[PDB]
Amino acid sequence: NLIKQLQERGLVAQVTDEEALAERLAQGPIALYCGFDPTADSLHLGHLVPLLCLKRFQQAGHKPVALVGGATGLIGDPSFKAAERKLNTEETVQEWVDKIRKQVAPFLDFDCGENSAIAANNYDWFGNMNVLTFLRDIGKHFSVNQMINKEAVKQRLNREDQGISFTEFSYNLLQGYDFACLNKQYGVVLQIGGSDQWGNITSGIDLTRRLHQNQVFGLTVPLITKADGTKAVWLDPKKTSPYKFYQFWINTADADVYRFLKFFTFMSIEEINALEEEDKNSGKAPRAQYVLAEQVTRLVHGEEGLQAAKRITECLFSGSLSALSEADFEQLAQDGVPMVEMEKGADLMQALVDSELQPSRGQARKTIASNAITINGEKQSDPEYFFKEEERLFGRFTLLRRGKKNYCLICWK
Amino acid sequence: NLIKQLQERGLVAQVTDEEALAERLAQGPIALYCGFDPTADSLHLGHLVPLLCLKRFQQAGHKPVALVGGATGLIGDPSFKAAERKLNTEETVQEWVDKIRKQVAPFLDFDCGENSAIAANNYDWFGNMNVLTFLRDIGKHFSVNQMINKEAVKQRLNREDQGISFTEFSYNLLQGYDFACLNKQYGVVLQIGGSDQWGNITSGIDLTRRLHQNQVFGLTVPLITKADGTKFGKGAVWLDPKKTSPYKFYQFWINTADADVYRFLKFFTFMSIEEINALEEEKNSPRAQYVLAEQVTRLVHGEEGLQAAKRITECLFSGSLSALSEADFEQLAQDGVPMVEMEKGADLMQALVDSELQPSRGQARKTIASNAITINGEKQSDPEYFFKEEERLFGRFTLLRRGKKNYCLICWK
Ligand SMILES: Nc1cc(CO)cc2ncn([C@@H]3O[C@H](COS(=O)(=O)NC(=O)[C@@H](N)Cc4ccc(O)cc4)[C@@H](O)[C@H]3O)c12
Numbered sequence A: 001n002l003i004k005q006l007q008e009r010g011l012v013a014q015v016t017d018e019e020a021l022a023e024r025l026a027q028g029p030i031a032l033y034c035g036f037d038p039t040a041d042s043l044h045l046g047h048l049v050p051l052l053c054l055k056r057f058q059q060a061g062h063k064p065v066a067l068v069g070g071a072t073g074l075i076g077d078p079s080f081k082a083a084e085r086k087l088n089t090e091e092t093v094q095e096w097v098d099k100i101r102k103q104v105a106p107f108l109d110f111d112c113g114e115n116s117a118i119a120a121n122n123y124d125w126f127g128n129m130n131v132l133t134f135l136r137d138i139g140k141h142f143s144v145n146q147m148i149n150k151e152a153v154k155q156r157l158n159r160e161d162q163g164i165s166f167t168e169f170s171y172n173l174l175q176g177y178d179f180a181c182l183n184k185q186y187g188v189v190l191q192i193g194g195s196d197q198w199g200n201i202t203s204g205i206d207l208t209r210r211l212h213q214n215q216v217f218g219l220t221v222p223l224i225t226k227a228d229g230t231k232a233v234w235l236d237p238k239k240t241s242p243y244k245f246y247q248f249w250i251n252t253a254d255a256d257v258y259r260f261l262k263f264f265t266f267m268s269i270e271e272i273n274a275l276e277e278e279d280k281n282s283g284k285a286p287r288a289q290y291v292l293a294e295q296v297t298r299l300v301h302g303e304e305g306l307q308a309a310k311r312i313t314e315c316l317f318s319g320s321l322s323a324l325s326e327a328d329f330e331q332l333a334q335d336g337v338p339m340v341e342m343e344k345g346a347d348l349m350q351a352l353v354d355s356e357l358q359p360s361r362g363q364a365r366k367t368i369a370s371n372a373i374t375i376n377g378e379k380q381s382d383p384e385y386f387f388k389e390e391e392r393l394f395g396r397f398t399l400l401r402r403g404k405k406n407y408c409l410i411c412w413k
Numbered sequence B: 001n002l003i004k005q006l007q008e009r010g011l012v013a014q015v016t017d018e019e020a021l022a023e024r025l026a027q028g029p030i031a032l033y034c035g036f037d038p039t040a041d042s043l044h045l046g047h048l049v050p051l052l053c054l055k056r057f058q059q060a061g062h063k064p065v066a067l068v069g070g071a072t073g074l075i076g077d078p079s080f081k082a083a084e085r086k087l088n089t090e091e092t093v094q095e096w097v098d099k100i101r102k103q104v105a106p107f108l109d110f111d112c113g114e115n116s117a118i119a120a121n122n123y124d125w126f127g128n129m130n131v132l133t134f135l136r137d138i139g140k141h142f143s144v145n146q147m148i149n150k151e152a153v154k155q156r157l158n159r160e161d162q163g164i165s166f167t168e169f170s171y172n173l174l175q176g177y178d179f180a181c182l183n184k185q186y187g188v189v190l191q192i193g194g195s196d197q198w199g200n201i202t203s204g205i206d207l208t209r210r211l212h213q214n215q216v217f218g219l220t221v222p223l224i225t226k227a228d229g230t231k232f233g234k235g236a237v238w239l240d241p242k243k244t245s246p247y248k249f250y251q252f253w254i255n256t257a258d259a260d261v262y263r264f265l266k267f268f269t270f271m272s273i274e275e276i277n278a279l280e281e282e283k284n285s286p287r288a289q290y291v292l293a294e295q296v297t298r299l300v301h302g303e304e305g306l307q308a309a310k311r312i313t314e315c316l317f318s319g320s321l322s323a324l325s326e327a328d329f330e331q332l333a334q335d336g337v338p339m340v341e342m343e344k345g346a347d348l349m350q351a352l353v354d355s356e357l358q359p360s361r362g363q364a365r366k367t368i369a370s371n372a373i374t375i376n377g378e379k380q381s382d383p384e385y386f387f388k389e390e391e392r393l394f395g396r397f398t399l400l401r402r403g404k405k406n407y408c409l410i411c412w413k
């Protein structure tokens, strides 16, 4: 059972009429969908959870539909959000829609026969729908009594300051109608998404019945709570660098790593169980984090992205910046380590103070005399030192390190 | 001051920023409006209360807009209604719109210069409004927290089985936008209606501030509760003479209770307040009910309708039917007196049975013999009598009275 496999990965929060849905999956290929609203330049890690689930369904022969909310992004999903969001402009939303559509596409196969993926956009049907048609044909099927009691919006109806507009209150009906549109258009019988989307999904199941007299299903994937109780890292490399992305996975807590392998990679459950059991009986610290980091970093940023993240990680730890490119240095200045902008000619002592690495020039004196300051890796032990011109690599980068762990990159101006 | 005068008639339930509206009315003509939704093929006496108020404003030099809800009648006003209403089709709503527009027109001056009345229909702007445009441009200004605290819908928001659909819940936004739309189109700065419409009116005052940065006002007229606790009008008394004959209409007013009649002159007539008060002084040994019936019947059904009602009332009181026309007997058949259809050749005994004036032929015989029965106002005491052909007036009508008061109209088949 595909559903059963997803359960042992931890990827099933809830599922409507599980026995019927499972019989439909065993019967043959179904079509399913997940929606993504455009609220930013790019998706982030959280979005991968249902997005990679679409691919898991496709790998079992089913047909995934990835919807971008061209219309619903002009409305705003309130589900489990504490505060009303400001409306975005049509112009901004459209540019975001195109970027998110192009981000989604490489994660699904658009060329594998009958079950090839489909890109969709609900603006196609909401852009020409009259309000009276929407109020009558769709709105009559919704009880405000039930709507105001849904978990996703209940808390917004406590105090009026942090209330909810009629605009965001109507969102649930737009996403409901989406399910009925994709049912009629492509035979979609399953919608998946995170557990916050449950109420938006069941509205689409019910409305699809009332409108199209068809039985469809929903399945939710979990929202991740870390083992310690906690929870942004974008897929766009110009927002989160491949090096920062890689390091984020490297620092995964021991109690989260195997679950995260299940959620964010396509490693078999057997290989994941073998890794956990190797980590268990080996008398060393876990190595799973390195496996997770390579896996997801290659997935999102490719082999080139992976090797650059490794190369930077290696040089930062070794002290040898000779391997690094200019582009490698640009990731460091974006994301990887704290940075400052100093005009050339400064001595190493005033380098430490201005970056908030050393408090005073007198403290920098003893710090530099104690052989505790590296410059691009090579020890420099004398206070009165100035940077040689060769040390400013690619004309604009030198990397300070106090002790072993404290970094600042100076981007000379 | 037009507002003070209306208050002396008891026609003002509530008013917003009253001092400010009063100064605005005193400065010069304003444009004002009232809306009427098509829920039947005719208006009834209730609608007269705000409709005649539109006229009262026009007589003071202001410009009335009478709006018929071609769009809101496709949605359904839930305010202070115990139960969800069934949706009406576009075809039948359009029928009602034109009948109601034609009913309303004679009550206002459409040809008196600058302040000529205007007929409006909110389908002209809602019939083609896109739903996203509606949810964004209008629905963002509406707090759901506030909507569910409107008195008009509180009784519907407690239990799903007596609940409210998203359809009827949104009605408040359409009426709110109407006000803003009429403000921009015509400079409308005032909306009137019954006190049941208060929440719909104040939502339009608010939205007009948000959309057009303009100050507008609202004034409501009371809902009439008769002095004996029962709600006014209750079936209903329709303006359409094919639903309520002018004779039935006139008798309704003739039989007003003395505790109501002076309140009803103020509400349903254009008599001066000074005259109404003078009439109430009667203690010299009341004309009020007759003045009320005369005024409103002339208003709604014209002089001809008034003379018809009086002519039938007198003929029924006197028993002499020679004044009644065939159209007059048709009013009687419609709703004036009990009627029964009978095949020609029935005898007097059977007519009395079939009309339920008598329970059996044996009893009818005695009753006839006792001289209790009139035929077209003439005594007939022969129990074995058959009607004469000349007693079928116009070939089709014969009026029976048993005793001094119990009528039944035979309509010969
Ligand atoms: N799964 C998951 C896990 C984590 C780690 O704990 C963080 C996440 N952050 C997000 N997600 C999940 O990503 C998906 C997209 O997110 S969204 O754009 O906000 N979606 C919406 O706003 C929908 N209303 C879009 C929609 C529009 C039209 C339609 O017809 C159907 C749907 C959702 O299924 C989230 O549950 C996360």
Ligand SMILES: Nc1cc(CO)cc2ncn([C@@H]3O[C@H](COS(=O)(=O)NC(=O)[C@@H](N)Cc4ccc(O)cc4)[C@@H](O)[C@H]3O)c12
Residues within 6 Å of the ligand: B034, B035, B036, B037, B038, B045, B046, B047, B049, B050, B067, B069, B072, B077, B122, B174, B175, B176, B178, B179, B192, B193, B194, B195, B196, B197, B200, B221, B222, B223, B224, B225, B232
């Ligand atoms: N005043 C009064 C008194 C009595 C004696 O007790 C009985 C009455 N029965 C009715 N009324 C009054 O007649 C008017 C029409 O009634 S309605 O069609 O139901 N209206 C509606 O449904 C509005 N939503 C129409 C509307 C639409 C668009 C818009 O932009 C503005 C308004 C209302 O002002 C009632 O208060 C009565």
Ligand code: NA
Residues within 6 Å of the ligand: A034, A035, A036, A192, A193, A194, A197
């Ligand atoms: Na989703």
Ligand code: NA
Residues within 6 Å of the ligand: B034, B035, B036, B050, B192, B193, B194, B197
């Ligand atoms: Na009204």
